């Protein structure tokens, strides 16, 4: 039931007080209405009803899904989820905002309003039903057949026994992705790459690295990737919708622990190879502490001197995580 081909739209059946799901696709898809008992979820405890025409519009999470393998709510009775919700849509799409309110007696009303102004007669409709003891729930929907710049603005619903809650409608262009890097970690740390983005419509995302591309678990939405497998390199996140694209390059590195086991010396010249992100080198009567000044100057390795006097000499790698060394003889 993924959002493939043209996403579902809504239309109120002219005959009765009920909604109809119009999802476009080539081959026609499976149109199923799903009403959840709580705010959430897809867990098999809620109610799925494949009918294309829904009559029981009262309920917590109502959403229509188009499948075939090719509803914005304001609860005055409930606490606000976010500070001033934003509803984005492309010009031409149908706006649908359902306002629900629960009161003890039926003595209460619900009203929709724009920026301090009344709503059009063919842009509103209200339903009502009874709950628990003698409770009354009311749904006052507002709808736009085809949106335009004219219809963009702050919509609010107020009740004659409830606090006025609002939401702003943003309706411009045909598709956007708004999202705001190099990293390095020690071989022991648990890390996840992250990307926060506010984008519409629902984007198709892909986390690719070297050639191996893996999909993602997508106010804003945050996509994550944790199967790094401590493998270093460029992890590129490419996300795109119908009228917009995006790509973010993430560099990754490992701990600066130096391996100095690669000792080597040609006759009359010597050096050591250091496998560490940040190497820094150091070259008889003294107990292996006297520093040899040297003649020459010093994932990747690093390299040192030319012979003057023959003896055993130690050479060290230095990094954020201390030191490591190896000793070579200056003979031939």
Partner 1 sequence: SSGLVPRGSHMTQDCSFQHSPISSDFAVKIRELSDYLLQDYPVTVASNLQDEELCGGLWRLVLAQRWMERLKTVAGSKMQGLLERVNTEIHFVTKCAFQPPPSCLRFVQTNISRLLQETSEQLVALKPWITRQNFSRCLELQCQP
Ligand X SMILES: *[C@@H]1O[C@H](CO)[C@@H](O[C@@H]2O[C@H](CO)[C@@H](O)[C@H](O)[C@H]2NC(C)=O)[C@H](O)[C@H]1NC(C)=O
- Enumerate binding residues for ligand X (CB under 6 A): 104, 133
Q: Which three-class secondary structure string do you get for 176-201?
A: EEEECCEEEECCCCCCCEEEEEEEEC
Q: Per CB under 8 A, does 109 bind partner 1?
A: yes
CB of 172 to ligand NAG, least distance (A): 8
Q: Is the CB of 81 or the CB of 160 nearer to partner 1?
A: 160
CB of 251 to partner 1, least distance (A): 59
Q: How many residues bind partner 1 (CB under 8 A)?
A: 15
Per-residue binder mask for partner 1 (CB under 8 A), 39-78, x = binder? ----------------xx----------------------
Q: Which does 176 bind (CB under 5 to 8 A by kind): ligand X, ligand NAG, partner 1, none?
A: ligand NAG
Q: Is the CB of 104 or the CB of 295 nearer to ligand X?
A: 104
CB of 162 to ligand X, least distance (A): 16
Q: Is residue 183 within 8 Å of 237, Cβ to Cβ?
A: no
Positions in 78-107 near partner 1 (CB under 8 A): 105-107
- Closest by CA to 260, choosing from 275, 244, 246, is 275
CB of 45 to partner 1, least distance (A): 20
Length in residues, the chain = 332
CB of 146 to ligand NAG, least distance (A): 10
Phi, psi of 149 (to 5 degrees): -60, -35
Pairing of strands 269-275, 259-266: antiparallel
DSSP 218-249: ---EEEEE---TT--EEEEEEEEETTEEEEEE
Torsion angle (degrees, nearest 10) of CA 172, 79, 48, 215 = 60
Q: Is the CB of 17 or the CB of 151 nearer to partner 1?
A: 17
Pairing of strands 47-49, 162-170: unpaired
């Amino acid at each position: 039931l993924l959002y493939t081909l043209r996403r579902p739209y809504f239309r109120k059946m002219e005959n009765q007080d009920a909604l109809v799901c119009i999802s476009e696709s080539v081959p026609e898809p499976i149109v199923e209405w799903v009403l959840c008992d709580s705010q959430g979820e897809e867990s098999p405890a809620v109610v799925k009803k494949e009918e294309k025409v829904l009559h029981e519009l009262f309920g917590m999470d109502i959403r229509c899904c188009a499948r075939n393998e090719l509803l914005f709510t304001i609860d005055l009775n409930q606490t606000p989820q976010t500070t001033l919700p934003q509803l984005f849509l492309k010009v031409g799409e149908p706006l649908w905002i359902r306002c629900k309110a629960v009161h003890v007696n039926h003595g209460f009303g619900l009203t929709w309003e724009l920026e301090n102004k009344a709503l059009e007669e063919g842009n509103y409709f209200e339903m009502s039903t009874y709950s628990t003891n003698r409770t009354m729930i009311r749904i006052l929907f507002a709808f736009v057949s085809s949106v335009a710049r004219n219809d963009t603005g702050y919509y609010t619903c107020s009740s004659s026994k409830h606090p006025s809650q609002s939401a702003l409608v943003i309706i411009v262009e045909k598709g956007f992705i708004n999202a705001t890097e190099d990293y390095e970690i020690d071989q022991y740390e648990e890390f996840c790459f992250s990307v926060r983005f506010k984008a519409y419509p629902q984007i198709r995302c892909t986390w690719t690295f070297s050639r191996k591309s893996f999909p993602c678990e997508q106010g804003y939405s945050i996509s994550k990737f944790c199967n790094h497998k401590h493998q270093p390199g460029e992890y590129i996140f490419h996300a795109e919708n119908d009228d917009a694209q995006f790509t973010k390059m993430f560099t990754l590195n490992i701990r600066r622990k130096p391996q100095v086991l690669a000792e080597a010396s040609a006759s009359q010249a010597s050096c050591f190879s250091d496998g560490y992100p940040l190497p820094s080198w150091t070259w008889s009567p003294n107990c292996t502490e006297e520093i040899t000044e040297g003649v020459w100057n010093r994932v990747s390795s690093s390299t040192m001197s030319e012979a003057i006097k023959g003896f055993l000499v130690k050479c060290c790698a230095y990094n954020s995580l201390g030191t490591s060394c190896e000793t070579i003889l200056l003979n031939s």
